[PDB]
Paper text:
In general, they harbor an N-terminal A domain that is followed by a region carrying a highly variable number of serine/threonine-rich tandem repeats (B region). The A domain that is crucial for adhesion comprises the binding site, which, in the case of PA14 domain-related adhesins, recognizes disaccharidic ends of glycans in a C-type lectin-like manner. Binding is achieved via a Ca2+-ion being complexed by a unique DcisD motif and further amino acid residues in two calcium binding loops (CBL1, CBL2). In this study, we mined the genomes of ascomycetous fungi for hitherto unknown PA14/Flo5-like adhesin domains and identified such domains in several putative GPI-CWP adhesins of methylotrophic yeasts from the Komagataella genus.
KpFlo2 bears likewise an A domain (Q33-V256) sharing a high pairwise sequence identity of 59% with KpFlo1A. Unlike KpFlo1 and KpFlo3, the stalk-like B-region of KpFlo2 is not made up of any agglutinin-like repeats. Whereas KpFlo2A lacked any specific glycan binding and represents currently an orphan lectin with unknown target, we found a high preference of KpFlo1A for terminal N-acetylglucosamine (GlcNAc) besides minor contributions from a few glycans bearing terminal galactosyl moieties. KpFlo2 represents currently an orphan lectin, as we found no target glycan when screening CFG glycan arrays, which are biased toward mammalian glycans by omitting microbial and plantal glycan structures. As a fungal PA14/Flo5-like adhesin both KpFlo A domains have a conserved β-sandwich, which consists of a six-stranded and a four-stranded β-sheet. L1 adopts a similar conformation as in the structures of the Lg-Flo1, ScFlo1, and ScFlo5 A domains, whereas L2 lacks the subdomain characteristic of S. cerevisiae Flos like ScFlo1 or ScFlo5. Both KpFlo A domains contain the shortest L2 loops of all A domains with known structures, leaving thus more space for the binding pocket. Structural differences between Cea1A and KpFlo2A are mainly found for the L1 and L3 loops (for nomenclature refer to) as well as for the neck regions. The dimeric arrangement of KpFlo2A as found in its crystals is unrelated to Cea1A. These dimers are physiologically irrelevant as formation of a continuous β-sheet structure in KpFlo2A crystals depends on an intervening N-terminal hexahistidine-affinity tag without affecting the putative glycan binding site. The observed pentagonal-bipyramidal and distorted hexagonal coordination geometries of the Ca2+ ions in the KpFlo1A and KpFlo2A complexes, respectively, exclude the binding of Mg2+ ions to the glycan binding site, although Mg2+ is present in 4:1 and 40:1 excess over Ca2+ in the crystallization conditions.
Residue numbers in the entry: 41 to 253
């Protein structure tokens, strides 16, 4: 009720993020700075692929000469012009400070945390943002010189309560050449994990009795 972030869910759970690839269109590089497109506008694009069960989402790709790759078990994915969304329920094992990090992103990524900005507790497809400041993290790779790597890293930390579920939604864009999406989590003791296994979860359809916010 007054949690403003957390869901209470009593249902069979499944490991992993839901990953969805959207249709890149020419000129989307200019939209990586657009607060409408990066929050909900991309949901107007055709969904090309959808899978579930991703617990280790980070990747770094650059293979000139071969423009496609296998991403999360999806074959023939264009990694140079990529629109990628992750959605899942983050579950705290203990009460304490958990972190979510986006490191050296190329080209751009945005992170929404909590039921008011990521998605609705009982409907992962119910997504709407109220303002352009709803995000928890936003990063874009701007050439700060002669370097080939984004030197910026971002971390969102929040005190979470044990047993509760927190909606998490990311959107990642690669415009050209290198694709770097390094998305990690941090435990209250400071341990940084690249694999979200046992912390990121999915549910099927949820009734009013199994889901409360
Ligand atoms: Ca790039
Ligand atoms: Mg398991
Ligand atoms: Mg336990």
């Amino acid at each position: 009720s007054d949690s403003a972030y957390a869901c209470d869910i009593d249902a069979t759970r499944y490991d992993g993020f839901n990953a969805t690839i959207y249709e890149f269109q020419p000129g989307d590089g200019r939209l990586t700075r657009d607060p409408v497109f990066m929050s909900t506008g991309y949901l107007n694009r055709t969904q090309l692929h959808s899978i579930t069960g991703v617990t280790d989402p980070g990747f770094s790709i650059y293979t000139p000469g071969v423009p496609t790759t296998t991403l999360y078990g999806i074959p023939n994915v264009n990694w140079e012009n990529l629109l990628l969304e992750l959605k899942g329920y983050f579950r705290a094992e203990v009460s304490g400070d958990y972190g979510l990090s986006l490191r050296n992103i190329d080209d751009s990524a945005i992170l929404f945390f909590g039921k008011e900005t990521a998605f609705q507790c009982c409907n992962e497809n119910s997504i709407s943002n109220e303002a352009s400041t709803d995000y928890s993290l936003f990063t874009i790779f701007r050439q700060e010189g002669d370097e080939t790597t984004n030197l910026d890293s971002f971390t969102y930390t929040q005190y979470l309560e044990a047993g509760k579920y927190y909606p998490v939604r990311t959107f990642f864009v690669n415009i050209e050449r290198h694709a770097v999406f390094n998305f990690t989590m941090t435990l209250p003791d400071g341990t940084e994990l690249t694999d979200f296994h046992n912390y990121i979860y999915q549910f099927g359809a949820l009734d009013e009795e199994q889901c409360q916010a």
